[PDB]
Amino acid sequence: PVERMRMRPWLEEQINSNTIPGLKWLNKEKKIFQIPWMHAARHGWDVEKDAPLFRNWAIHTGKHQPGIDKPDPKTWKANFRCAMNSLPDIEEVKDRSIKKGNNAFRVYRMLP
């Protein structure tokens, strides 16, 4: 169980269910998951890869609520970045010059 769907279990749930075909476990056995991130829009204005997530932000983490205040996606995108600077077991791996077929995602490795 969990106290309030922390980001750890929130990511294990998103991936376990497969919310996006670009984000998933490359080796969930050792807790290794890679994300696609942005590969087209300089930043947003089109991120179907992380579009259904970027929204869960605010209403999720707990920094905003629709139907009460105004929405602000600017800071929401800054949160995802911290999601990588968090959990002291993640290892961002966007491949260098070996695993570069035609996507190259930020493969984050989580230690068990």
PDB file of C-alpha atoms in Angstrom:
ATOM      1  CA  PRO A   1       0.000   0.000   0.000  1.00  0.00           C
ATOM      2  CA  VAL A   2       1.069   3.672  -0.016  1.00  0.00           C
ATOM      3  CA  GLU A   3       0.264   6.860   1.932  1.00  0.00           C
ATOM      4  CA  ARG A   4      -0.722   9.119  -0.992  1.00  0.00           C
ATOM      5  CA  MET A   5       0.354   7.607  -4.354  1.00  0.00           C
ATOM      6  CA  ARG A   6       3.926   8.931  -4.071  1.00  0.00           C
ATOM      7  CA  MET A   7       5.777   9.666  -7.329  1.00  0.00           C
ATOM      8  CA  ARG A   8       7.569   6.293  -7.016  1.00  0.00           C
ATOM      9  CA  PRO A   9       4.383   4.199  -7.068  1.00  0.00           C
ATOM     10  CA  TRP A  10       2.746   6.721  -9.412  1.00  0.00           C
ATOM     11  CA  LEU A  11       5.441   5.971 -12.012  1.00  0.00           C
ATOM     12  CA  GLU A  12       5.337   2.222 -11.311  1.00  0.00           C
ATOM     13  CA  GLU A  13       1.568   2.406 -11.920  1.00  0.00           C
ATOM     14  CA  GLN A  14       1.735   4.521 -15.108  1.00  0.00           C
ATOM     15  CA  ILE A  15       4.367   2.221 -16.628  1.00  0.00           C
ATOM     16  CA  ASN A  16       2.844  -1.013 -15.266  1.00  0.00           C
ATOM     17  CA  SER A  17      -0.400  -0.037 -17.038  1.00  0.00           C
ATOM     18  CA  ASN A  18       1.436   1.419 -20.053  1.00  0.00           C
ATOM     19  CA  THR A  19       0.011   4.941 -20.434  1.00  0.00           C
ATOM     20  CA  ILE A  20       2.319   5.666 -23.398  1.00  0.00           C
ATOM     21  CA  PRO A  21       4.075   3.333 -25.862  1.00  0.00           C
ATOM     22  CA  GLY A  22       7.168   5.558 -25.568  1.00  0.00           C
ATOM     23  CA  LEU A  23       7.554   5.219 -21.779  1.00  0.00           C
ATOM     24  CA  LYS A  24       7.953   1.758 -20.188  1.00  0.00           C
ATOM     25  CA  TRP A  25      10.169  -0.789 -18.377  1.00  0.00           C
ATOM     26  CA  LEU A  26      13.118  -1.896 -20.537  1.00  0.00           C
ATOM     27  CA  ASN A  27      13.891  -4.315 -17.697  1.00  0.00           C
ATOM     28  CA  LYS A  28      11.336  -3.986 -14.871  1.00  0.00           C
ATOM     29  CA  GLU A  29      13.156  -6.983 -13.354  1.00  0.00           C
ATOM     30  CA  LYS A  30      15.864  -4.578 -12.146  1.00  0.00           C
ATOM     31  CA  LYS A  31      13.401  -1.650 -12.126  1.00  0.00           C
ATOM     32  CA  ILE A  32      14.753  -0.048 -15.328  1.00  0.00           C
ATOM     33  CA  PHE A  33      12.380   2.232 -17.261  1.00  0.00           C
ATOM     34  CA  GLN A  34      13.010   4.558 -20.221  1.00  0.00           C
ATOM     35  CA  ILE A  35      10.928   7.557 -21.268  1.00  0.00           C
ATOM     36  CA  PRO A  36      10.644   9.140 -24.747  1.00  0.00           C
ATOM     37  CA  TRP A  37      10.491  12.790 -23.555  1.00  0.00           C
ATOM     38  CA  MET A  38      10.428  15.422 -26.317  1.00  0.00           C
ATOM     39  CA  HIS A  39      11.705  14.595 -29.820  1.00  0.00           C
ATOM     40  CA  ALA A  40       9.842  17.231 -31.864  1.00  0.00           C
ATOM     41  CA  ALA A  41       8.441  20.367 -30.172  1.00  0.00           C
ATOM     42  CA  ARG A  42      11.299  22.449 -28.744  1.00  0.00           C
ATOM     43  CA  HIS A  43       9.469  21.835 -25.440  1.00  0.00           C
ATOM     44  CA  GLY A  44       5.657  21.511 -25.490  1.00  0.00           C
ATOM     45  CA  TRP A  45       3.067  22.821 -28.004  1.00  0.00           C
ATOM     46  CA  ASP A  46       2.791  19.128 -29.015  1.00  0.00           C
ATOM     47  CA  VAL A  47       3.868  16.311 -26.690  1.00  0.00           C
ATOM     48  CA  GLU A  48       1.379  13.462 -27.216  1.00  0.00           C
ATOM     49  CA  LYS A  49       4.181  11.305 -25.765  1.00  0.00           C
ATOM     50  CA  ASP A  50       3.921  12.976 -22.363  1.00  0.00           C
ATOM     51  CA  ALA A  51       0.668  14.860 -23.039  1.00  0.00           C
ATOM     52  CA  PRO A  52      -1.654  12.646 -20.935  1.00  0.00           C
ATOM     53  CA  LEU A  53       0.907  12.899 -18.112  1.00  0.00           C
ATOM     54  CA  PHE A  54       1.773  16.569 -18.224  1.00  0.00           C
ATOM     55  CA  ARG A  55      -1.951  17.055 -17.481  1.00  0.00           C
ATOM     56  CA  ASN A  56      -2.180  14.638 -14.540  1.00  0.00           C
ATOM     57  CA  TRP A  57       0.388  17.086 -13.097  1.00  0.00           C
ATOM     58  CA  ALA A  58      -1.064  19.705 -10.738  1.00  0.00           C
ATOM     59  CA  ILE A  59      -4.206  17.679  -9.959  1.00  0.00           C
ATOM     60  CA  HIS A  60      -1.706  14.855  -9.286  1.00  0.00           C
ATOM     61  CA  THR A  61       1.402  16.055  -7.397  1.00  0.00           C
ATOM     62  CA  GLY A  62      -0.836  18.611  -5.647  1.00  0.00           C
ATOM     63  CA  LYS A  63       0.039  22.096  -6.938  1.00  0.00           C
ATOM     64  CA  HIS A  64      -3.262  23.091  -8.585  1.00  0.00           C
ATOM     65  CA  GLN A  65      -6.935  22.131  -8.991  1.00  0.00           C
ATOM     66  CA  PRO A  66      -9.320  22.762 -11.905  1.00  0.00           C
ATOM     67  CA  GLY A  67     -12.670  24.375 -11.026  1.00  0.00           C
ATOM     68  CA  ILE A  68     -11.057  26.453  -8.250  1.00  0.00           C
ATOM     69  CA  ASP A  69      -8.017  28.341  -9.608  1.00  0.00           C
ATOM     70  CA  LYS A  70      -6.350  29.001 -12.988  1.00  0.00           C
ATOM     71  CA  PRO A  71      -4.311  26.243 -14.662  1.00  0.00           C
ATOM     72  CA  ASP A  72      -0.587  26.763 -15.374  1.00  0.00           C
ATOM     73  CA  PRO A  73       1.255  24.187 -17.514  1.00  0.00           C
ATOM     74  CA  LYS A  74       4.490  26.233 -17.462  1.00  0.00           C
ATOM     75  CA  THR A  75       5.512  25.020 -13.980  1.00  0.00           C
ATOM     76  CA  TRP A  76       3.901  21.603 -14.582  1.00  0.00           C
ATOM     77  CA  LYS A  77       6.617  20.831 -17.166  1.00  0.00           C
ATOM     78  CA  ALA A  78       9.302  21.873 -14.652  1.00  0.00           C
ATOM     79  CA  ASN A  79       8.036  19.187 -12.241  1.00  0.00           C
ATOM     80  CA  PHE A  80       8.669  16.235 -14.591  1.00  0.00           C
ATOM     81  CA  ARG A  81      12.321  17.336 -14.827  1.00  0.00           C
ATOM     82  CA  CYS A  82      12.608  17.173 -11.018  1.00  0.00           C
ATOM     83  CA  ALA A  83      11.071  13.682 -11.142  1.00  0.00           C
ATOM     84  CA  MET A  84      14.493  12.724 -12.499  1.00  0.00           C
ATOM     85  CA  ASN A  85      16.502  14.690  -9.924  1.00  0.00           C
ATOM     86  CA  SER A  86      14.485  12.789  -7.280  1.00  0.00           C
ATOM     87  CA  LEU A  87      14.556   9.087  -6.263  1.00  0.00           C
ATOM     88  CA  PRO A  88      18.245   8.431  -5.427  1.00  0.00           C
ATOM     89  CA  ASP A  89      18.232   5.222  -7.516  1.00  0.00           C
ATOM     90  CA  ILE A  90      17.323   6.553 -10.997  1.00  0.00           C
ATOM     91  CA  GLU A  91      20.013   6.691 -13.711  1.00  0.00           C
ATOM     92  CA  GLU A  92      19.096   8.769 -16.781  1.00  0.00           C
ATOM     93  CA  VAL A  93      20.528   7.082 -19.891  1.00  0.00           C
ATOM     94  CA  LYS A  94      19.631   8.788 -23.201  1.00  0.00           C
ATOM     95  CA  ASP A  95      22.086   6.510 -25.022  1.00  0.00           C
ATOM     96  CA  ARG A  96      25.299   7.995 -26.456  1.00  0.00           C
ATOM     97  CA  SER A  97      26.638   6.335 -29.624  1.00  0.00           C
ATOM     98  CA  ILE A  98      25.449   2.720 -29.454  1.00  0.00           C
ATOM     99  CA  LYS A  99      21.694   2.311 -28.893  1.00  0.00           C
ATOM    100  CA  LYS A 100      20.602   4.932 -31.447  1.00  0.00           C
ATOM    101  CA  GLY A 101      18.121   3.300 -33.855  1.00  0.00           C
ATOM    102  CA  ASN A 102      15.615   6.115 -34.489  1.00  0.00           C
ATOM    103  CA  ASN A 103      14.281   7.297 -31.107  1.00  0.00           C
ATOM    104  CA  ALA A 104      16.877   7.439 -28.300  1.00  0.00           C
ATOM    105  CA  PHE A 105      14.744   7.856 -25.156  1.00  0.00           C
ATOM    106  CA  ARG A 106      15.952   8.972 -21.717  1.00  0.00           C
ATOM    107  CA  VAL A 107      16.326   5.440 -20.321  1.00  0.00           C
ATOM    108  CA  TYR A 108      16.211   5.948 -16.543  1.00  0.00           C
ATOM    109  CA  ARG A 109      17.517   3.018 -14.474  1.00  0.00           C
ATOM    110  CA  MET A 110      16.079   2.563 -10.963  1.00  0.00           C
ATOM    111  CA  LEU A 111      18.079   0.463  -8.473  1.00  0.00           C
ATOM    112  CA  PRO A 112      16.114  -2.073  -6.406  1.00  0.00           C
TER     113      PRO A 112
END
